[PDB]
Scaffold this active site. Structure first.
Site: not given
Lengths: 158, 52, 29, 158, 52, 29
Positions: D36, D58, D110
């Site tokens: 992402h 992901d 992240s």
């Protein structure tokens, strides 16, 4: 840990014209010598010997004479995750990949065995590949009566 | 005589491909200081009759 | 002639049938 | 426990226009980066690299160059019920669900790995869901040579 | 010629559905730092010939 | 014509017969 001195009884220099390239070790009851390292080993009764063998493993294995059975080292086949040693320092075995400090090996130091603690030979150094601060070895170990050579990505032969 | 020669150049080839497959299957067992796994003693005619 | 060239014609494809299988195994290990 | 300092050698900032969104970590021998988090990672020789991969997990996984094999961390695959740590504090693993204190994570953190004790990377933080006093993580761990992402009920991606 | 074109739009579809099923079955094995499970080496033609 | 449209007509339903089974397995894990 003082018992790295006994490698001189089970090692020989092999020269091609007068310069030393590698070493023909004497593990167990069989002369092992890496197949790339050329020349004639500096021992007369170990010279006249028909022992040209396979090249997928890059070895060249022999049968030692009867009057030199007692100059050999001791072989073993198990290895735990620990702290092993050879002539140029001290290594460790983590995840099936021996590692040394960078620069302890030079192009011309093949045939060097690796002892464990009791002076028991585990494998044969014949390569190396610079990861950076550390470098891993290309090496020919035997699990149990089957030699399997290991090769990391992008090595070169010493 | 050419058929008498195409036999010997087609009976040596099938004998050459057994000596190669005999070699490649037991070449590590001669390099280590170890045994022969006696099942392969029965199937393949191994040079360690029991020695080395 | 078909019996002669079907015996060692069938010996040869069995000799390849071993060596294809052996190099399939002891390249892997 | 001082060895959270070595994450800076195996982390990079990725920016989309000039602002930092996430981090492309460098576990093992493969650049991992959450699929992402967008932009271009702040490293030239790691930019020109074709590595667009799956999106069910992901991730977006790569192959690191040869002159940066020695800047990588150490991966492992086992985890007991204990006390693990990452950059913003200290976590615990109970019943297959990492938990942090509420508010230690921000939308934009992240790609942060999680070390165990020895500086061995276990997983990759990429989510979070507010249970209340505590909050659990969405995380991409690997059991043994198979990455499996975990996702609690009603998360959002940081 | 339409039957000569309904072949190629029905022989590519059955080849498209093998490349997708080849992809989805071994995509996690390429992401981790791990091995290939050599049974699936035999059945599926895997790109790790042995590398990565 | 039935032999032509029964071979690759029977190839195609076997290609679906894999992909229905593979997505039944590796959605689950």
């Amino acid at each position: 840990r003082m018992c790295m001195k006994i490698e001189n009884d089970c090692i020989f220099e092999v020269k091609l014209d007068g310069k030393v390239t590698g070493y023909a070790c004497l593990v167990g009851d069989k002369v092992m010598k890496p197949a790339h390292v050329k020349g004639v080993i500096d021992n007369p009764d170990l010279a006249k010997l028909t022992y040209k063998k396979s090249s997928k493993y890059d070895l060249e294995c022999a049968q030692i004479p009867v009057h030199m059975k007692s100059d050999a080292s001791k072989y073993t086949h198990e290895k735990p995750e620990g702290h092993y040693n050879w002539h140029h320092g001290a290594v460790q075995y983590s995840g099936g990949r021996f590692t040394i400090p960078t620069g302890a090996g030079k192009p011309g130091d093949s045939g060097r065995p690796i002892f464990d603690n009791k002076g028991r030979v585990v494998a044969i150094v014949l390569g190396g590949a610079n990861e950076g601060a550390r470098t891993a070895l290309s090496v020919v170990t035997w699990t149990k009566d089957m030699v399997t050579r290991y090769t990391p990505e992008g090595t070169e032969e010493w | 005589s050419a058929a008498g020669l195409a036999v010997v150049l087609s009976l040596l080839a099938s004998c050459y491909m057994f000596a190669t497959a005999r070699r490649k299957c037991l070449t590590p067992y001669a390099l280590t200081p170890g045994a022969v796994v006696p099942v392969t003693l029965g199937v393949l005619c191994c040079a360690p009759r029991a020695h080395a | 002639v078909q019996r002669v060239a079907g015996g060692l014609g069938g010996l040869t494809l069995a000799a390849v049938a071993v060596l294809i299988l052996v190099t399939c195994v002891t390249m892997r290990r």
